[PDB]
Design a protein around this ligand. Structure first.
Ligand SMILES: Nc1ncnc2c1ncn2[C@@H]1O[C@H](COP(=O)(O)OP(=O)(O)OP(O)(O)=S)[C@@H](O)[C@H]1O
Ligand SMILES: Nc1ncnc2c1ncn2[C@@H]1O[C@H](COP(=O)(O)OP(=O)(O)OP(O)(O)=S)[C@@H](O)[C@H]1O
Ligand SMILES: Nc1ncnc2c1ncn2[C@@H]1O[C@H](COP(=O)(O)OP(=O)(O)OP(O)(O)=S)[C@@H](O)[C@H]1O
Ligand SMILES: Nc1nc2c(ncn2[C@@H]2O[C@H](COP(=O)(O)OP(=O)(O)O)[C@@H](O)[C@H]2O)c(=O)[nH]1
Ligand SMILES: [Mg+2]
Ligand SMILES: [Mg+2]
Ligand SMILES: [Mg+2]
Lengths: 332, 330, 318, 257, 352
DNA sequence: TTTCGGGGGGGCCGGGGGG
DNA sequence: CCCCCCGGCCCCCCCGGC
C-alpha cells in the first residue's frame, strides 16, 4: 500500500517471487508434494531473502488460516535463554499438530507437522543450541526446525550437522536485475540506462539496500517534478559514494608522500562525513584494477586494505584508521 | 510422529534400529555386542565427533537388551532436560536404587551429551555410580572430553567413535539408493564422500536435496553437477583454475579470473579458500616459510570472513597472500 | 543377558588394609592405628583412583568390627551436606552415646569433602573439638586446598602419591591369577602405560580386554585403549619440522575424531608442563595457543586454525 | 462430537485428579465405550499411576470410537481451577483430536465456560500391568495406613513392610531412632469398615521410599479403605476403590543390597 | 538562555547550511506516509538533531517541540531495578538506551516493542480519538548500542513498520552492524563550511549587539572549531563574556580545560621519556578519566596533538599513528581504558 | 567492579489439617 | 471458627582453572 516502505511492500508473497535462490527454492517447492521437509539452516549475507523465503514457504504450506497455529517464531527480539529453550520450545515441539479444516485440506497440502523458526539464531548462546539438539532430534515426527543466520560459524557443529544447509547467494546486477526492474516499472520510476545496474553494483549483494536507494531516488525525482530520468550521479550521491575527483585528489596526495599534507587533507576530508568503509572500498577498486603498479605493490596494498577493513569492522575511529592506511600506502 | 516414516527427514528415517545397521564402527560394535551377550556390560563413555553413531549405537544396545519396551526400562537424560545437582541427588539416585516396574532386570541410565553437565552434578554422580554398580550401569555420550571431570572419566570404559570411513558411507548410500529408487554416478558419490567429512547426517541431507533437485527422479541420475548445484560448492575445475591463475598470471588477470569464477555460479569465498587450502596441503614446497605464511594469512582471512566484512577486499587479500607466500620459493 | 556381573574394580576392591598397594609408609601407619586404635582426625588427599576411599573404608571396618553399622556415619557429594545438615545430623551423631571397646571411637567419613562449602567446614570445627573423646573425622579429597585451614589444623595430613608401575603390575598380576587370564608381558606393559597410575582405569581396561579379545597382548589392548592424546600433543609440539607437526596433527588427532577444542586445551596444558623448553619460549607459545583457543571458542573450529597455530609455534621456536 | 462425557459436578473429576497430581506430570487417557483408562509414570520411573473410571460415573457418556489423549497434569489442574465446583463438567473430543474441550455449565444461570486444552503427542501402551497371583494381599482403612506412613516417615526416608502369618509389620530405621508398628487381622461386625483383612501365601519383606508412600496416601480422600498387594520380584500395588472405578499405584521396591 | 540554544532553527525553512541536504529532507517529508527508517550519520555538532527535529516538524505539526520527560521502570533477570528517562511529545518518543549500558537490550525488547505493538489514543486533531498515523522513535547515540540491542532491533523494524518508524543519529556508522544499516535509509550530514559558520556567528552577534572590531574574528573562531557549530557558538559566547561583550582582533581563542590538560600531557611525553614520566602520565590519565572524559576522545586528541609537534620526524609520526590505530582497536574490544591508554603512551615513549 | 547460570540458605506467604 | 505444620515461591549472596 501507500503507507508501507517499498522493501516491505514488495516482500515476496510466494516462493515464485524469490528472485535468485533457485538452488534451494526448487527443493523447498519439491517438499510441497514430497511432504518430508527436513530441518533447515538458512545462511547468507544481509538482505538475500531468507526470512522472506521461510515466510513464503509457510504461507504455501498451511495457507493464511492454519499458519498461525502451525508456526512458532522466535527472533533476537525475544528472550531465548537455556530455560526458554528447555521449556517453551520443548512444549511447543511436543504438541500435536492442529487439526486442519476441510477448506485447508482441499486447498493446501497441509503437511503433518509444525514449524519452529529461530530467526537470527547466531545470537543464541551455545548452551541453548545444545539444549535444542535432542529436542529437534526426538520430535522430528511432528515438528521441523528452521535456523536463519548471517554467520554460520556461530552455530554449534551438532546443530549444523542436524540441519540441511541452504546458502543464499549474494544478489547482484546479473541475477537480481529483473526484480528491481519490475519494482521500478510498477512504481513508474523513470531511470536512465544502467541506473539499475549501478544501484545493484553499489548495494553489493543486498537487494534491500538497492530497493531503498531506488525509493529514495524516486522520491527525489518526484519532489523535483521535472519529468526527467533519474541519472547515475544522484544515485551515487544518495548512496554516499565519494566523487571520483575527491578520490583522485586523495590518490595524488598519497603519491606525494608528505605526512603533513596527507594529515591536513584527511582532516579536511573527514568533515564531509564520508564513511570509512566506502572510501576503503573505492581505494581498493582504484588500486587493484590499475595497471600502473607492480605485483609487489599490489601484494602489500591488498594486505594493508584487509587489515584496515578488519579494524574498521570492530567499530574503531574512522579518522585514525583512514589516516594510518593512507600513510602506510604512501610509504609503499 | 504423524502419518508415516515416509514423512520423516532422511537423517531420521534411516536411524539404525539394530547394532547390525551401525556402519564404520566395527571394533566398538563387536566389543559391546560381546559384552551384552555375556552379561559383562561395564559403565560406558562413548566419545566422538558429530554424526558418527553414538546415540544410535546406545539406543540400539538398549533395544537389544530390553526389547521394544526399552523406553520404559531405561532412564535417558540429555541437554534438553534439567540435570542439576538436585536432579542427580533425587531422580537418578532413586532410579539407580530401585527395582524395575514392568519386568525384572538391571537398570540402564543414559546421560547423553554429558559434556553439557555442571561440575557439581558430575561430582555428585561419582558415588551414585560406585555404590549401585551391582544393579545399575551408566552410559555417557560426549563430543568434548575436556568438559568431563577426571573422576567421572576414571569410572567409565572409553570407546572412541572415529569419523566414518569411506566404505561405510558407500554401503549406507547403496542401501539408501536401494530403498529410494535413485541412480548415483561414481563421480557424484566421490564428491559426496569428499564433502561429507565423515558425517552421515551430511550424506543423507545432501542426498535428499539432490533427489529433490532432480526433475524426474525415477529416470534421472544424480551427477556431480547436481551435487555442486544443490550444495552450491565450487567444482574442482574452478578451484584448479583459480589457483593456476593466481600462481601463474598477473594481478589484473588473477582478479578478473577470480571474479568471473565466483560470479558464474555465485560461489562463496570461504569455500574457495577451503578448496585451495586442501589443494596446497599436497604441494611440496621447498621452503617452510612459504607454508608458514600461507597458513597464517589464510587463517587470518578465514577469521575475518567469519565476522563479515568486505568480500572483494578479502578476495584480493587471498590473492596477495598466495602470491607473497609463493614468492619465497625463488 | 539381564543378569549383570560385578566389575573387577568392585569385585576385587581391597577389603583389608593389607591388600592395598602403594603409599607403603601411610598404609603401614594406618595398619598400626587399626591395631592400636586411637584413630586421629585425618585428611587423605591425592588424585583419582589411588585407593583413598578404599583405605578409609578398610580402616573403619577393621577398627569397628561388627559395630560398623552404628559407629560409622558416611556422607559424600551424592548426599546433602549443607550447613543445616552439619549442624543437626552430624552434631547429633557426634553427641550420640555408643558402647565400643576401650580403644575405639565413632567415625564420620566425609568423602569428597572438597565439595563442601565454607560454612559447613566452619560449623564442623567445634563439633570436632568438643566430641573428640567419642567421635573421629576422616576426610577424603582430591584437592586439599579446598579444605579450610582451621579444619586442616585439626587433622593429620596424608597426601597419597601415585602408584608406581611396580605396584600396578603387582595388583594386575594378582587379579589375573585370581581370574585365570591369559596374557603377555607386552599386554601388561601397554595396560600400565595407558593407565597413567590410575588403578581403576588399569583394571577396567584389563577387563575390557579378555572380555572382548581373550588374550591381553599389546595389539589387542591398543585396538580398544587409545594411547593418551596428551603424549601425542607433546610429540606434535616438540617435532623438529613443521611438516612433521602437521602430519602428526592430521593423522593422530584430526583423523581420529578429536575435537579442535580438546586439542587446543591439551596443547595449553602440555606447553604449561614442558620443562625442557625455556620459560619465555613457553610463554610465547602459550600466547599463540590462547589466540587460537579464543578463535575456536568463537566458532572457527577448523583444521586451518590449528595448522596456523602450529606454524606460529614453529616460527617462535626458530 | 466423537467423545462426550458429562460429570454432574466438576468436584468428582477434580478430586480424582488431585489424588495423583503430585507424583506424575504427563498422563495419557484412553477413552472407549467402557469408560476412561488413564496411565502416568513419574520422572524417576519408580511409580506408576493407573486410573479407571467406568461409564456409571458420568451422567451421560458417549464414545463412538476409542480415542487417546496425552496431556500434562499441571495444565489440566490450572484449567480446572478456573471452573466452579458446582457446575456440570463436560469433556468433549473429536476424531484424531488436537485438543480437549472442558465445558463448565451452571444450570442456575446462563454462564457457559469453554476451555480448550492442547493435547501432546504421546505414543505409549498401558501394558495392563497386574500380577496374577500375588504372594500376599491385605486391605485396611486408609486412615490407619496414612497415619502409620506419616508417623514412620518422620523417622526415616525408607519404610519396610513385612507380611507374615497373621502379622503385618511396618518398620522404619533412622538417625534419631527406630519405629515399628505391628497389626494383626481382625473383623468386627459392628463396624466392618474398620476391619483389616489379610491373605498370605508366602512371607514377604519389601523396602520402599518414604516420599512415594507419602504421595500415595494422598489417595485416601477417594476411598475409606486401601488394598495392598505385595509380591517378591514384583512392584507393590496400592489400590483405592472408587464408586465405579479404581486408582492404582504400582511402586517398585528398593534393591536389597 | 545560551545563544547556542536560543537561536536554534525550528523548521526546515530556517536551516542555513547544506542546502542540498535541506532539499533532500523536504523531498523525504513531501510524502511521509511511506517514509522508511532513517539513519543520519555525521560529525558531532553539525546539526543532525536539529535537522531530525525539523523533519519531524515538517511531517507532524509544531507540537513536536512540546516535549516532556518521564521515567520508566525496568527489571532485569536478577530483579535489579533500572530507570530510563524518556523524552516524549504527542507525536514521537526519544530514547538513549546506552544510558543503561549492557542493559540497553532490555529497553529494545520491552519499551520499543510495547510502542510498536499497540495503538494510541489521540484526542486532539482526531475525531475518533484514535491516532491514524505511525509513531516515530528517535534513538540517540545509536552507535553506542550493544550488538544484542542492534540484533533485537532487526525484526522489530520490519514486523511493525506500519505502526513505528525509527530515526537514528550517529557520529560514525562503523559500530553499526550490517543488517541495521541495510534496514535504514542512510543520510550523510556534512559539517558546515567556514563561510556558513561565519554567517551564523555574524547573525548571532548582530542579534546580541556584540561590538566586533572586524569580522575576521568570527572567521578565527570558525577555524578553531574544526567544523563544530555548537563549539563555535559556545566559544563565541565565552569570548564575548570574557571581554565585556566587546571582542577585539587580539581576543584570544579559549580552549576547554581537558584540551589544555591533553596538550600539557603531550608536551610532557615529548620532553620526558622515562618510567617516572610514564607514572606521571598515568596519574594525569586517571585524573582525566575520573571527570567523565571518554577514553576514545582522550586517545584521539592525544594522537593528533602528538602529530602536531614540529620537532618530530616522519618516522616518529608514522609509528605514532600506527600505535594509535592498534590501541584504538584495543579500546574498542576492552573494558579497562586506562590499560590501553598506558600501553599506547609507553609505545609512543619507546618510539621517540 | 562486573555483562549468565547454577547452587545454597534464609525470610516470608499461604494451603491444608487439626481442635 | 481459629491456630499451627510444612510444602512452595521469592529473594539475596557467592563461584565459575587444574
Ligand atoms: N531473494 C529476494 N527476492 C526478492 N526480494 C528480496 C529478496 N531478498 C531480499 N529481498 C527484498 O529485501 C527485502 C528484505 O528481504 P529479507 O528476507 O528480509 O532478507 P534477509 O536475508 O532475511 O535479511 P537479514 O539476513 O535478516 S539482514 C524483501 O522484502 C524483499 O523486498
Ligand atoms: N554409524 C552410522 N551408521 C548409520 N547411520 C549413521 C551412523 N552414524 C550416524 N548415522 C546417521 O546419522 C544420524 C544421526 O546419527 P547419531 O547417532 O545421532 O550421531 P551422534 O554421534 O550421536 O550425534 P551427536 O554426537 O549428538 S552431534 C542417524 O539417524 C543415522 O541415520
Ligand atoms: N591401592 C589400590 N590397590 C588395589 N586396588 C585399588 C587401589 N586403588 C584403587 N584401587 C582399585 O580401584 C578401585 C577404586 O579405588 P578408589 O578407592 O575408589 O580410588 P579413589 O582415589 O578413592 O577415587 P577418587 O579420588 O574418589 S576419583 C578399588 O575398588 C580398587 O579395586
Ligand atoms: N543558524 C543555524 N544553526 C544550526 C543549524 N544546524 C545546527 N545549528 C546549530 O548548531 C547547534 C548544534 O546542532 P546539533 O544538531 O545539536 O549537533 P549534532 O546533533 O551533534 O549534529 C545547534 O544548537 C544549533 O544552534 C542551521 O542549520 N542553522
Ligand atoms: Mg532476516
Ligand atoms: Mg547423539
Ligand atoms: Mg573415592
Amino acid at each position: 500500500l501507500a503507507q508501507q516502505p517499498w522493501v516491505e511492500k514488495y516482500r515476496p508473497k510466494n516462493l515464485d517471487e524469490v528472485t535468485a535462490q533457485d538452488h534451494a527454492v526448487t527443493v523447498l517447492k519439491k517438499t510441497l508434494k514430497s511432504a518430508n521437509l527436513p530441518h533447515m539452516l538458512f545462511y547468507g549475507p544481509p538482505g538475500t531473502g531468507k526470512t522472506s523465503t521461510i515466510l513464503a514457504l509457510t504461507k504455501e504450506l498451511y495457507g493464511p488460516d492454519l499458519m498461525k497455529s502451525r508456526i512458532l517464531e522466535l527472533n533476537a527480539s525475544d528472550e531465548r535463554g537455556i530455560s526458554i529453550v528447555r521449556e517453551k520450545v520443548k512444549n511447543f515441539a511436543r504438541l500435536t499438530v492442529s487439526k486442519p479444516s476441510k477448506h485447508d485440506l482441499e486447498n493446501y497440502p497441509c503437511p503433518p507437522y509444525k514449524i519452529i523458526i529461530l530467526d537470527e539464531a547466531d545470537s543464541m548462546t551455545a548452551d541453548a543450541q545444545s539444549a535444542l539438539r535432542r529436542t529437534m532430534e526426538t520430535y522430528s515426527g511432528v515438528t521441523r526446525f528452521c535456523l536463519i543466520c548471517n554467520y554460520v560459524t556461530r552455530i554449534i557443529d551438532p546443530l549444523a550437522s542436524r540441519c540441511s544447509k541452504f546458502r543464499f547467494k549474494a544478489l547482484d546486477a546479473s541475477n537480481a536485475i529483473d526484480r528491481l526492474r519490475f519494482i521500478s516499472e510498477q512504481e513508474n520510476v523513470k531511470c536512465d540506462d544502467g541506473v539499475l545496474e549501478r544501484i545493484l553494483d553499489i548495494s553489493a549483494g543486498d537487494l534491500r539496500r538497492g530497493i531503498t536507494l531506488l525509493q529514495s531516488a524516486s522520491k527525489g525525482a518526484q519532489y523535483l517534478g521535472d519529468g526527467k530520468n533519474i541519472t547515475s550521479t544522484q544515485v551515487e550521491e544518495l548512496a554516499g559514494v565519494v566523487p571520483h575527483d575527491i578520490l583522485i585528489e586523495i590518490v595524488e596526495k598519497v603519491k606525494s608522500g608528505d605526512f603533513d599534507e596527507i594529515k591536513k587533507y584527511v582532516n579536511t576530508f573527514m568533515k564531509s562525513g564520508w564513511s570509512a568503509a566506502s572510501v576503503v572500498n573505492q581505494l581498493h577498486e582504484y588500486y587493484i584494477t590499475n595497471d600502473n603498479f607492480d605485483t609487489n605493490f599490489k601484494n602489500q596494498i591488498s594486505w594493508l586494505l584487509f587489515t584496515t577493513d578488519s579494524r574498521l569492522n570492530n567499530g574503531t575511529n574512522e579518522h585514525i584508521q583512514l589516516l594510518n592506511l593512507l600513510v602506510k600506502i604512501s610509504q609503499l | 510422529e504423524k502419518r508415516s516414516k515416509e514423512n520423516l527427514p532422511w537423517v531420521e528415517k534411516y536411524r539404525p534400529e539394530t547394532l547390525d545397521e551401525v556402519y564404520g564402527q566395527n571394533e566398538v560394535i563387536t566389543t559391546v555386542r560381546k559384552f551384552v551377550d555375556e552379561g559383562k556390560l561395564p559403565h560406558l563413555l562413548f566419545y566422538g565427533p558429530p554424526g558418527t553413531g553414538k546415540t544410535s549405537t546406545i539406543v540400539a544396545l538398549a533395544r537389544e537388551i530390553y526389547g521394544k519396551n526399552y523406553s520404559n526400562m531405561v532412564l535417558e537424560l540429555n541437554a534438553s532436560d534439567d540435570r542439576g545437582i538436585d536432579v542427580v541427588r533425587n531422580q537418578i539416585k532413586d532410579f539407580a536404587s530401585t527395582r524395575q516396574i514392568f519386568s525384572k532386570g538391571f537398570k540402564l541410565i543414559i546421560l547423553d551429551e554429558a559434556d553439557a553437565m555442571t561440575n557439581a552434578a558430575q561430582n555428585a554422580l561419582r558415588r551414585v555410580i560406585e555404590r549401585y554398580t551391582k544393579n545399575t550401569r551408566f552410559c555417557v555420550l560426549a563430543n568434548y572430553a575436556h568438559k568431563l571431570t577426571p573422576a567421572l572419566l576414571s569410572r567409565c570404559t572409553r570407546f572412541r567413535f572415529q569419523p566414518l570411513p569411506q566404505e561405510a558411507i558407500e554401503r549406507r548410500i547403496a542401501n539408501v539408493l536401494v530403498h529410494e529408487k535413485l541412480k548415483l554416478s561414481p563421480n557424484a558419490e566421490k564428491a559426496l564422500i569428499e564433502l561429507s567429512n565423515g558425517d552421515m547426517r551430511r550424506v543423507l541431507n545432501v542426498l535428499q536435496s539432490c533427489k529433490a533437485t532432480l526433475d524426474n527422479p525415477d529416470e534421472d541420475e544424480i551427477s556431480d553437477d547436481v551435487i555442486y548445484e544443490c550444495c552450491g560448492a565450487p567444482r574442482p575445475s574452478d578451484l584448479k583454475a583459480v589457483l593456476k591463475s593466481i600462481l601463474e598470471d598477473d594481478w589484473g588477470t588473477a582478479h578478473y579470473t577470480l571474479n568471473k569464477v565466483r560470479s558464474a555460479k555465485g560461489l562463496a569465498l570461504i569455500d574457495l579458500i577451503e578448496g585451495i587450502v586442501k589443494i596446497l596441503e599436497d604441494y611440496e614446497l621447498q621452503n617452510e616459510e612459504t607454508r608458514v605464511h600461507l597458513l597464517t594469512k589464510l587463517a587470518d582471512i578465514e577469521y575475518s570472513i567469519s565476522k563479515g566484512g568486505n568480500d572483494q577486499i578479502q578476495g584480493s587479500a587471498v590473492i596477495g597472500a598466495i602470491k607473497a607466500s609463493f614468492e619465497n620459493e625463488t | 543377558t539381564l543378569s549383570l556381573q560385578l566389575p573387577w574394580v568392585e569385585k576385587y576392591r581391597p577389603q583389608v588394609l593389607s591388600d592395598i598397594v602403594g603409599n607403603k609408609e601411610t598404609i603401614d601407619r594406618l595398619q598400626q592405628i587399626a591395631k592400636d586404635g586411637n584413630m586421629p582426625h585425618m585428611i587423605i588427599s591425592g588424585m583419582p583412583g589411588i585407593g583413598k576411599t578404599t583405605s578409609v573404608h578398610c580402616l573403619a571396618h577393621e577398627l569397628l568390627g561388627r559395630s560398623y553399622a552404628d559407629g560409622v556415619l558416611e556422607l559424600n557429594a551424592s548426599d546433602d551436606r549443607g550447613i543445616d545438615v552439619v549442624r543437626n545430623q552430624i552434631k547429633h551423631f557426634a553427641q550420640k552415646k555408643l558402647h565400643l571397646p576401650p580403644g575405639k571411637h565413632k567415625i564420620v567419613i566425609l568423602d569428597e569433602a572438597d565439595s563442601m562449602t565454607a560454612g559447613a567446614q566452619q560449623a564442623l570445627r567445634r563439633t570436632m573439638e568438643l566430641y573428640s573423646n567419642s567421635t573421629r573425622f576422616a576426610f577424603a579429597c582430591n584437592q586439599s586446598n579446598k579444605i579450610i585451614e582451621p579444619l586442616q589444623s585439626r587433622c593429620a595430613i596424608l597426601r597419597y602419591s601415585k602408584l608406581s608401575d611396580e605396584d600396578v603390575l603387582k595388583r594386575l598380576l594378582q587379579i589375573i591369577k585370581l581370574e585365570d587370564v591369559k596374557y603377555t608381558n607386552d599386554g601388561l606393559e601397554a595396560i600400565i602405560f595407558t593407565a597413567e597410575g590410575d588403578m581403576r582405569q588399569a583394571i577396567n581396561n584389563l577387563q575390557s580386554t579378555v572380555a572382548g579379545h581373550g588374550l591381553v597382548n599389546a595389539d589387542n589392548v591398543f585396538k580398544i585403549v587409545d594411547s593418551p592424546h596428551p603424549l601425542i600433543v607433546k610429540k606434535m609440539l616438540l617435532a623438529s619440522n613443521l611438516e612433521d607437526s602437521i602430519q602428526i596433527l592430521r593423522t593422530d588427532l584430526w583423523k581420529k575424531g578429536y575435537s579442535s577444542i580438546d586439542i587446543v586445551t591439551t596443547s595449553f596444558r602440555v606447553t604449561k608442563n614442558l620443562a625442557q623448553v625455556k620459560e619465555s619460549v613457553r610463554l610465547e607459545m602459550i600466547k599463540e595457543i590462547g589466540l587460537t583457543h579464543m578463535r575456536i571458542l568463537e566458532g572457527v573450529g577448523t583444521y586451518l586454525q590449528l595448522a596456523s597455530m602450529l606454524a606460529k609455534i614453529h616460527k617462535l621456536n626458530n | 462430537s466423537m467423545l462426550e462425557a458429562k460429570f454432574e459436578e466438576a468436584s468428582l473429576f477434580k478430586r480424582i485428579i488431585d489424588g495423583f497430581k503430585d507424583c506424575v506430570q504427563l498422563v495419557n487417557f484412553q477413552c472407549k465405550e467402557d469408560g476412561i483408562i488413564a496411565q502416568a509414570v513419574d520422572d524417576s520411573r519408580v511409580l506408576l499411576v493407573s486410573l479407571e473410571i467406568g461409564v456409571e460415573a458420568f451422567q451421560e457418556y458417549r464414545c463412538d470410537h476409542p480415542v487417546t489423549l496425552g496431556m500434562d497434569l499441571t495444565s489440566l489442574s490450572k484449567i480446572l481451577r478456573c471452573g466452579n465446583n458446582t457446575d456440570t463438567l463436560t469433556l468433549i473430543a473429536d476424531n484424531t483430536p488436537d485438543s480437549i474441550i472442558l465445558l463448565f455449565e451452571d444450570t442456575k444461570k446462563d454462564r457457559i465456560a469453554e476451555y480448550s486444552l492442547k493435547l501432546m503427542d504421546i505414543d505409549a501402551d498401558f501394558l495392563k500391568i497386574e500380577e496374577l497371583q500375588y504372594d500376599s494381599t491385605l486391605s485396611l482403612p486408609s486412615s490407619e495406613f496414612s497415619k502409620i506412613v506419616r508417623d514412620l516417615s518422620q523417622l526415616s526416608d525408607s519404610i519396610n513392610i513385612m507380611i507374615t502369618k497373621e502379622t503385618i509389620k511396618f518398620v522404619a530405621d533412622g538417625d534419631i531412632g527406630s519405629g515399628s508398628v505391628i497389626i494383626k487381622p481382625f473383623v468386627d461386625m459392628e463396624h466392618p469398615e474398620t476391619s483389616i483383612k489379610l491373605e498370605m501365601d508366602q512371607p514377604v519383606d519389601l523396602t520402599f521410599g518414604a516420599k512415594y508412600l507419602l504421595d500415595i496416601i494422598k489417595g485416601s480422600s477417594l476411598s475409606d479403605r486401601v488394598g495392598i498387594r505385595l509380591s517378591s520380584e514384583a512392584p507393590a500395588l496400592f489400590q483405592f476403590d472408587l464408586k465405579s472405578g479404581f486408582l492404582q499405584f504400582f511402586l517398585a521396591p528398593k534393591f536389597n543390597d | 538562555s545560551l545563544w547556542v540554544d536560543k537561536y536554534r532553527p525550528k523548521s526546515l525553512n530556517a536551516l542555513s547550511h547544506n542546502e542540498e541536504l535541506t532539499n533532500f529532507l523536504k523531498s523525504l517529508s513531501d510524502q511521509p506516509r511511506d517514509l522508511p527508517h532513517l539513519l543520519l550519520y555525521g560529525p558531532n555538532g553539525t546539526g543532525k538533531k536539529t535537522r531530525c527535529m525539523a523533519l519531524l516538524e515538517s511531517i507532524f505539526g509544531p507540537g513536536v517541540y512540546r516535549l516532556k520527560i518521564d521515567v520508566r521502570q525496568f527489571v532485569t533477570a536478577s530483579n535489579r531495578k533500572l530507570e530510563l528517562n524518556v523524552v516524549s511529545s504527542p507525536y514521537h518518543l526519544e530514547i538513549t538506551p546506552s544510558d543503561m549500558g549492557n542493559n540497553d537490550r532490555i529497553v529494545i525488547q520491552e519499551l520499543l516493542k510495547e510502542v510498536a505493538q499497540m495503538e494510541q489514543v489521540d484526542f486532539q486533531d482526531s475525531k475518533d480519538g484514535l491516532a491514524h498515523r505511525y509513531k516515530c522513535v528517535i534513538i540517540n547515540e545509536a552507535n553506542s548500542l550493544t550488538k544484542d540491542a542492534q540484533a533485537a532491533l532487526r525484526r522489530t523494524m520490519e514486523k511493525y513498520s506500519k505502526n513505528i518508524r525509527l530515526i537514528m543519529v550517529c557520529d560514525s556508522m562503523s559500530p553499526i552492524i550490517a543488517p541495521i544499516k541495510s534496514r535504514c535509509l542512510l543520510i550523510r550530514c556534512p559539517a558546515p563550511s567556514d563561510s556558513e559558520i561565519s554567517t551564523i556567528l555574524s547573525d548571532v552577534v548582530t542579534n546580541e549587539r556584540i561590538q566586533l572590531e572586524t569580522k575576521d574574528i568570527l572567521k578565527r573562531i570558525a577555524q578553531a572549531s574544526n567544523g563544530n557549530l555548537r563549539v563555535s557558538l559556545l566559544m563565541l559566547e565565552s569570548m564575548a563574556l570574557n571581554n565585556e561583550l566587546a571582542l577585539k582582533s587580539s581576543s584570544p581563542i579559549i580552549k576547554p580545560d581537558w584540551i589544555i590538560v591533553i596538550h600539557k600531557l603531550t608536551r610532557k611525553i615529548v620532553k620526558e621519556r622515562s618510567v617516572n614520566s610514564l607514572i606521571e602520565c598515568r596519574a594525569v590519565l586517571y585524573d582525566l578519566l575520573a571527570h567523565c572524559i571518554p577514553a576514545n576522545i582522550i586517545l584521539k586528541e592525544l594522537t593528533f596533538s602528538l602529530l602536531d609537534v614540529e620537532t618530530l620526524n616522519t618516522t616518529n609520526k608514522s609509528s605514532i599513528i600506527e600505535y594509535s590505530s592498534v590501541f584504538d582497536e584495543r579500546l574498542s574490544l576492552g573494558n579497562k581504558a586506562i590499560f590501553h591508554l598506558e600501553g599506547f603512551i609507553a609505545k609512543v615513549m619507546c618510539c621517540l
